[PDB]
Each structure stands twice: as C-alpha cells, then as structure tokens.
C-alpha cells in the first residue's frame, strides 16, 4: 500500500535526550530532560505532518488545530514504539530509558505505568512499523479538535488513512480479518494516556520549578 510506504519513508530520524552529565540526578533534572526532548520532537513532528497526503492542503488554522489536539498522542506513540522490545522500561530516547525506579524518582509512576499498558497491548498484537506509522497519522487526523474550519476535508484525510490501514491489513494479515479494527480499538487508551500526560505536565508548568521551552509551552497551553 502506497500511503503506508510513504509514511515509512517520511518517518523522521530519532533524536537524543542528552541529559546534562554535570547535573545531579533529581526529579527536576528528569523532567527538564523530558520537556527539552519533547520541545525538539515537536519541531520534528510539525515537519513530518507536512508529508501526510492532504495535510498541507488544509488551511493553516486547521493544520494548527490538528497538531494542537494530537501532539501528545504522537509523542506517546513514539515512546511506545521504541519500547516494544523492552520489558517494563520506556525508551524516551536511546540515551534515556526509564525503568520503574526512575519513574518513581521523576514522579511519573502512574503516567509511565499507563504508557507501559499501551506497550503491553501492542506487544501482544505484534505491532509492526507499517501499522505504527499509519496509526500515528490516523491519531493526527482523528484528533477531535473543536475548532475545525473544513470538517469535510478533515474527514477525507481520516478516510484516506483509514483506507490505507484497512488495505494494509487485508493484504498482510488475511489470518485476522478484524486486525484493522483491533488497531483502531487501541486509540482510546492512547487518547486517555495523552490526556493524563498533558494534565500532569501542565501541573508541572504551573508549579514553576521545571524550565520549559517555548514550543512545548505553546502546545501545552493550547490543550488546556
């Protein structure tokens, strides 16, 4: 399927967390590192979205609305995917892998446990890269922004990506004629986990102890 092949080639290079080796380990260090990484990933996500067939033909306001609604789901899906061959650890980046103990220290035990639940589900389904990239695009298109100008164009973008998923599954997974639907049925937990992450980091923002860069702040403010 061509849309799937295109999404695979459009998949961005990974980036490094680069935690500051001169700074003592603390909750503030961990959270600063993650927020800094997210800020840089957000730049990469914006560039990636322009490769999705039809996205750039939407008005700028609608492009903004989709990204404002979906950004954390896209970030989370990336962590989930990188974590699939790991056990009880989350690969935020190749140089930043959080186990349970580190999650507790960062005050992220509940959030990271929910992300691990998504990992566990996809592990059991043997999620493939083809399926990952297609679901990332579907999460963007299906992000439920209240502010869409051209609802019919957004529905068509949803349709295009949904068709690519169904087609991929029909060709590659004849053994399970419901596999496309099972993939779509993982989106509620992704949405739930994203909401949790957004609310947690917004609280962190309000508390004022973790410095945050401007893009990350902009995207956080737009969501709450």
């Amino acid at each position: 399927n061509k849309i799937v092949s295109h999404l695979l080639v459009a998949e961005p290079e990974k980036i490094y967390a680069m935690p500051d080796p001169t700074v003592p380990d603390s909750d503030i260090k961990a959270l600063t590192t993650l927020c800094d990484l997210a800020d840089r990933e957000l730049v990469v996500i914006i560039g990636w979205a322009k490769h999705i067939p039809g996205f750039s033909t939407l008005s700028l306001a609608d492009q903004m609305s989709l990204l404002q609604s979906a950004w954390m789901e896209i970030l989370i899906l990336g962590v989930v995917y990188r974590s699939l061959s790991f056990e009880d650890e989350l690969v935020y980046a190749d140089d930043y892998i959080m186990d349970e103990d580190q999650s507790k220290l960062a005050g992220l035990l509940d959030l990271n446990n929910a992300i691990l639940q998504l990992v566990k589900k996809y592990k059991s389904m043997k999620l493939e890269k083809e399926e990952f990239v297609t679901l990332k695009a579907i999460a963007l298109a299906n992000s439920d922004s209240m502010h869409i100008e051209d609802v019919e164009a957004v529905q068509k973008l949803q349709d295009v990506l949904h068709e690519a998923l169904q087609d991929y599954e029909a060709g590659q997974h004849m053994e399970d004629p419901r596999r496309a639907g099972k993939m779509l049925m993982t989106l509620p937990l992704l949405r739930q986990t994203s909401t949790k992450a957004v609310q947690h980091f917004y609280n962190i923002k309000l508390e004022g102890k973790v410095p945050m860069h401007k893009l990350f702040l902009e995207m956080l403010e737009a969501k709450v």
Binding site: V43, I46, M64, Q68, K214, L215
Partner: peptide
C-alpha cells in the same frame, strides 16, 4: 505564533 511559524517555514 511558533507553531504557525514552523508550519509556514521552508
């Protein structure tokens, strides 16, 4: 404005 800037960029 930053999201908008980046969407317009390159």
């Amino acid at each position: 404005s930053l999201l908008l800037h980046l969407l317009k960029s390159q």
